Amino acid sequence: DWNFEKMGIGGLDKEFSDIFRRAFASRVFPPEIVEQMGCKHVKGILLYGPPGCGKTLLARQIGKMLNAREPKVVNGPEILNKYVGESEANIRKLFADAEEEQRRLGA
Amino acid sequence: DWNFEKMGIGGLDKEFSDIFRRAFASRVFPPEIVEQMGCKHVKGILLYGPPGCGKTLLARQIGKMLNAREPKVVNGPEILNKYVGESEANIRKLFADAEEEQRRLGANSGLHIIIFDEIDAICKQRGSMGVHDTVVNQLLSKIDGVEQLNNILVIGMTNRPDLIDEALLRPGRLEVKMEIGLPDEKGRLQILHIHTARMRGHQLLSADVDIKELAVETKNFSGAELEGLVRAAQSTAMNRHIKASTKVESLQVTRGDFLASLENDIKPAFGTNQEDYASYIMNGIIKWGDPVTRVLDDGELLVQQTKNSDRTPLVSVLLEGPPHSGKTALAAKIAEESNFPFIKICSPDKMIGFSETAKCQAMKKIFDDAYKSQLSCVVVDDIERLLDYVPIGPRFSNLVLQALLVLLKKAPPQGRKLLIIGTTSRKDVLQEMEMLNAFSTTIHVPNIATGEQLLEALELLGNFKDKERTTIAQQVKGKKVWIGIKKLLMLIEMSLQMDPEYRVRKFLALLREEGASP
Ligand SMILES: Nc1ncnc2c1ncn2[C@@H]1O[C@H](COP(=O)(O)OP(=O)(O)OP(=O)(O)O)[C@@H](O)[C@H]1O
Ligand SMILES: Nc1ncnc2c1ncn2[C@@H]1O[C@H](COP(=O)(O)OP(=O)(O)O)[C@@H](O)[C@H]1O
Ligand SMILES: Nc1ncnc2c1ncn2[C@@H]1O[C@H](COP(=O)(O)OP(=O)(O)O)[C@@H](O)[C@H]1O
Ligand SMILES: [Mg+2]
């Protein structure tokens, strides 16, 4: 279970459990039963709200709660460069390392 | 054999058989007899249908049903990127693996399957409603040009079959075309059985989860959303054991989690969106007279007619009356009473600030979506506000009017059914705009007229006691009133704030000051 208060966040209490249960209950639990389950792991989340409510603060805390790598960052208005084709190059480079890790010594 | 159930495919049963018969048949029987006839093999297939209905699955499974090499993949819009010609040369190299192997082994080479995604972007290049002409011409030349290639195959899939140019769908090029549609109950049962198979292989499913019931519960679903439902149910059931119960074998899935996921988690895209009716029917409906009963009976008769008719697949009705009379609260109820799988509401509230072209596209998209389901009901709200009508000059938009007039008569395709309900507040203007001769029937919603009906409505609502009731009646029964229901609610709410002694008086005053009308 999770006690939000000591992680640096407070007030976003109810809207934490829903995401936790929905998309993070299958990255925990003994893996052996999950192998038989066959369920795949979610690969997307969307957050919306007014500015300055703590949206970024939640990502850097979810990252350090699943024992993951460090968060890569990207911006929207900058990747829309004039160079069409080099934007695709940036998109490729963004995944390059994770693609490589999955390609070798994966699972 | 044609065992399309052991490979993952579900509802699709006739499309597979026909496709295999017509295309993947010349390459199955003995080579000698085929050479004796010397018949050229098919070199193209086209697929269309609603998204997420099991298209790519069939494309990838068909190749493995045959014996071919790695199936390539190419994106539609990506092909029309910043550079062309170099990307055309990349297309040439994409097919060169088969080209060199072909001339090296003219009649003893394998299949080089290439799959096309969103072929609409690549081709089409319409001049109604530049650099891409080079790509369409190059693709046409390569597929079937002076050079002859036999050991390739092209499978294209799209979502808007009409946008495909007629040049491609000619003999030699892509000829066999197929439609993939939403599954019926049988398809849903087959898909649920396929996906919920491993679960029964380890006794991890409770005995109370009846697939047959779930099949009838979900209406107008898609395979992807069925898989999502199964995933959500599994997630909830498992999370039930990562809580106050045992912490990080007695694990099973119960129908309760399935029902919870159905009602809270997954929202179908071709289904009845229940959350939308909380903002159009707020205070319910109260029987203050005969007109409500008459209107509801008319609505139910219309629904019954459209559901059990074969010579009238299209029926429309118009509701009209004075302003502030509850027109948008009686139409939604009529639509909801019927159990039609597909229901939608197109209203101006979601088009604040649009141009005159976005509205036409939105309306056409809604009516296009409504055609896929086998039973529908679409509501248009506040037609005049939709037309941007102002009585000084006057002014309005012609495009929207023409689109509406054309749409209100196009019958549903093949063998389906429809029902369109409209709402308005100024019938004479519609009479002069010729629209009223496009609708099929009209219904009139009246206002409160006599004192007795006012007394009945006030009692049924319930705000005043016996003494105040008698006091109000004493004055009210001595004359006739004219006021709509919504204004009555507003006046009651305004009056109730005053102190108990003056309430009655205040209310009376308002009714006298505003009740001036015929
Ligand atoms: N029998 C009834 N018929 C209609 N509306 C009723 C009835 N009983 C209660 N109401 C309430 O009256 C209101 C009718 O809807 P609403 O206030 O939106 O009016 P309207 O006719 O849609 O208005 P307008 O056309 O001016 O936009 C809703 O609050 C509905 O709950
Ligand atoms: N629920 C919260 N608890 C504690 N601090 C918060 C919370 N929400 C926002 N903050 C404060 O806001 C600051 C910046 O928030 P930020 O992540 O930039 O929000 P956004 O990116 O949505 O503007 C942080 O220093 C953080 O302390
Ligand atoms: N008839 C079906 N039988 C079994 N699974 C299906 C069926 N239709 C869809 N699915 C599931 O839903 C997903 C739909 O993806 P796909 O059809 O590839 O999308 P698209 O058609 O847009 O390319 C598949 O991955 C598959 O698991
Ligand atoms: Mg209205």
Curated annotation (Swiss-Prot), chain B:
Its EC number is 3.6.4.6. Its cofactor is Mg(2+). GO terms for molecular function: ATP binding; ATP hydrolysis activity; ATP-dependent protein disaggregase activity; identical protein binding; ionotropic glutamate receptor binding; metal ion binding; PDZ domain binding; protein kinase binding. Mg(2+) binds at residue 328. Belongs to the AAA ATPase family. Homohexamer. Interacts with GABARAP and GABARAPL2. Interacts with GRIA2. Interacts with PLK2, leading to disrupt the interaction with GRIA2. Interacts with MUSK; may regulate MUSK endocytosis and activity. Interacts with CDK16. This is Vesicle-fusing ATPase. It comes from Cricetulus griseus (Chinese hamster). The lineage of its organism: Eukaryota, Metazoa, Chordata, Craniata, Vertebrata. The chain holds residues 212 to 740 of 744 of the full protein.
